[PDB]
């Protein structure tokens, strides 16, 4: 079956940087758009960033585009999210997802279990 596994979460302090990764198996990795979503306490699940199989990057808002960077390594079936200047508001569970057509919609076909990021001040 298809399997997406996130890692790299933990407890950081405000202003820190953090790199999350996502490893995929059971699909032909280079034919899928890959996306990061998050769910903060008291909020709905929301789009963070996406990188399509042709390499175009799409970001959620101005709150994200300046601080976060997304990339993929097709040779290793892995994608990464680099997060800089983290704030308490970024505390959330971060999910990796894959889909053959979608970009910003939360209705992607495949989902990982998520990794938890806590940011304290």
Author numbering: 1 to 52, 52A, 53 to 82, 82A, 82B, 82C, 83 to 100, 100A, ...
Report text from the authors:
Here, a microfluidic device is described that enables the production of crystals by counter-diffusion and their direct on-chip analysis by serial crystallography at room temperature. Furthermore, the crystal structures of four proteins and an RNA were determined based on serial data collected on four synchrotron beamlines, demonstrating the general applicability of this multipurpose chip concept.
Final crystal structures were obtained either from a single large crystal and two wedges (Nb02) or from combining partial data sets from several individual crystals (RNA, CCA, Lip and PhP1). However, with a lower beam intensity (compared with XFELs) crystals can be used to collect more than a single image and up to several degrees of rotation. With very stable crystals, a single crystal may even be sufficient to collect complete data with the help of high symmetry and rapid analysis using HPDs.
